[PDB]
């Protein structure tokens, strides 16, 4: 089972990078909700720029 999760770990780690930029937006819209209309442009660039 340790050998099996070693194979599964890379594919789930590649699946997690498509959801973390949505996770920061979901937290940031709760903490400050007054900039939810601007953020739909902002997330098309800086989802790369804060991940790297």
């Amino acid at each position: 089972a340790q050998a099996e999760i070693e194979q599964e770990l890379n594919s789930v780690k590649d699946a997690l990078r498509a959801q973390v930029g949505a996770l920061a937006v979901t937290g940031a819209e709760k903490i400050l909700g007054a900039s939810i209309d601007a953020n739909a442009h902002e997330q098309l660039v800086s989802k790369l720029a804060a991940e790297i």
Partner: protein, 509 residues
């Protein structure tokens, strides 16, 4: 094994977060020394309240002076510094309670240390309590069986009794208490084991022996090892006692071991001397009797009216109890020392373990001359109370005559036969570790000692005789042993069936 959608839990946590501002009462650390922190401010703090520091470190407020608050750190103090923030929590010192702690190893604040995930307890309760009063108690009469022949025959423990285990180092105090815990796995009594001041490898060996004998799922383990803070070593018996009092207050039955109350008194001595409190005998504080007596009073049996008052009518017609087995270490047999005499003045009897009987191979090592139970045969079952009347007197006749076996061929008949019966009863009470006996097997061994079926059997073949007799009754008279193991009944039918089976064993085997 790991799909990606099951890690969407984070989104749900964001949907249950309260980001509204809440008002706190805050202060600032002025001085840190030896686990004691002085704090300016905190003008709404209560006595006994948890105080939040950065890094997840908590403290407890002890000294509410007019211009400062003294607090004792409930953990490592060495990351705390002058200028850091302190917060009130609104909470007098609590632990989580519930059936979700069964099977788990925790620290003194209830956080898990076994690596098996978070504990999903639905309730907390206070660590410091006053025990329920005079009118809410009920007298003890139900049995707790340890599985040892000498303990269940001579010094019987009941539900709600406090029974001390006292003696020198390395002569089997943890062994008797852990085997009393393992014998509760099919009896309905839940278990708490509190280790104070022990080594971590000793604690991990104890929990591995609990899992190997099938009793870990019935037992909460609370651990405060020898390199923790003295505050956690002082506070861990009250936290485990609150964990047993959850089952006491709802009409169920629990059993707790404090495997060193002597190390808890050393840790409380350390805390009191660092507060510059003036000491007395053996440099202990003046309230050291109060340190043990606030704890052990909580072990009690409570009436049906208390249980009906606590659950607001939900549990009706049931008593609850909490049995305690505290453990005290002595120095070279000194039982008249200050802490051992303080705990004897609190419990309902004690079991003395003697070092010389341990070193001669009498391995359960119970000194029958000075061990006593204050409840006695009110707690015992009927067959065990009937068959153990002659054990203590046979061990009593052996005490002085055990040194006479080097010249016993030139003695009269009554002295020789009393000494022969004394050697047979002494060889019967030897027993191995991790081998519990039921009601029927100890009744078979006690009937074989009491009714004179050991008389033509030599000493080196007593206990092997006992094992063979138990095996014969397991393959020929199993319905008789299942009749005895119901509630320990005794009558003439059981008497006649046991004596016919023992005579057929002595004639044909």
């Amino acid at each position: 094994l790991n799909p990606s959608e099951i890690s969407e839990i984070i989104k749900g946590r964001i949907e249950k977060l309260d980001v509204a501002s809440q008002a706190r009462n805050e202060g600032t650390i002025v001085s840190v020394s030896d686990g004691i922190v002085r704090i300016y401010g905190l003008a709404d703090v209560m006595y006994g309240e948890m105080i939040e520091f950065p890094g997840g470190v908590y403290g407890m407020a002890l000294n509410l002076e007019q211009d400062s608050v003294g607090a004792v750190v409930l953990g490592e103090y060495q990351g705390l510094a002058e200028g850091m923030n302190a917060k009130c929590t609104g909470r007098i010192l609590e632990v989580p309670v519930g059936p979700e702690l069964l099977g788990r190893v925790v620290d003194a604040l209830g956080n898990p240390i076994d690596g098996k995930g978070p504990i999903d307890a639905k309730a907390t309760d206070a660590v410091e309590k006053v025990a329920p009063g005079v009118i809410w108690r009920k007298s003890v009469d139900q049995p707790v069986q340890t599985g040892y022949k000498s303990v269940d025959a001579m010094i019987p423990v009941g539900r709600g009794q406090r029974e001390l285990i006292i003696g020198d180092r390395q002569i089997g105090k943890t062994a008797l208490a852990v085997d009393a815990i393992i014998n509760q796995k099919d009896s309905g009594i839940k278990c708490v084991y509190v280790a104070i001041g022990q080594k971590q490898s000793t604690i991990a060996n104890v929990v591995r022996k609990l899992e190997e004998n099938g009793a870990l799922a019935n037992t909460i383990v609370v651990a405060a090892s020898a390199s923790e803070s003295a505050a956690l070593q002082y506070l861990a018996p009250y936290s485990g006692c609150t964990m047993g009092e959850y089952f006491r207050d709802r009409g169920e039955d629990a059993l707790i071991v404090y495997d060193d109350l002597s190390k808890q008194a050393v840790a409380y001595r350390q805390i009191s001397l660092l507060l510059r409190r003036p000491p007395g005998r053996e440099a202990y504080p003046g309230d050291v009797f109060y340190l043990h007596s606030r704890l052990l009073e909580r072990a009690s049996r409570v009436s049906e009216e208390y249980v009906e008052k606590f659950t607001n009518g939900a549990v009706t017609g049931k008593t609850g109890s909490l049995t305690a087995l505290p453990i005290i270490e002595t120095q070279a047999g000194d039982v008249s020392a200050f802490v051992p005499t303080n705990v004897i003045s609190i419990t309902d009897g004690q079991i003395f373990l003697e070092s010389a009987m341990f070193n001669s191979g009498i391995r359960p090592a119970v000194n029958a001359g000075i061990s006593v139970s204050r409840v006695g045969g009110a707690a015992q079952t009927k067959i065990i109370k009937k068959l153990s009347g002659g054990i203590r007197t046979a061990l009593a006749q052996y005490r002085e005559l055990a040194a006479f076996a080097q010249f016993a061929s030139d003695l009269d008949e009554a002295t020789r036969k009393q000494l022969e019966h004394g050697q047979r009863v002494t060889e019967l009470m030897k027993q191995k570790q991790y081998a519990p006996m039921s009601i029927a097997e100890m009744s078979l061994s006690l009937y074989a000692a009491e009714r004179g079926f050991l008389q033509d059997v030599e000493i080196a073949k007593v206990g092997s005789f006992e094992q063979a007799l138990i095996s014969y009754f397991q393959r020929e008279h199993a319905a008789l042993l299942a009749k005895i193991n119901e509630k320990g009944d005794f009558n003439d039918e059981i008497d006649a069936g046991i004596k016919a089976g023992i005579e057929k064993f002595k004639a044909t085997q």
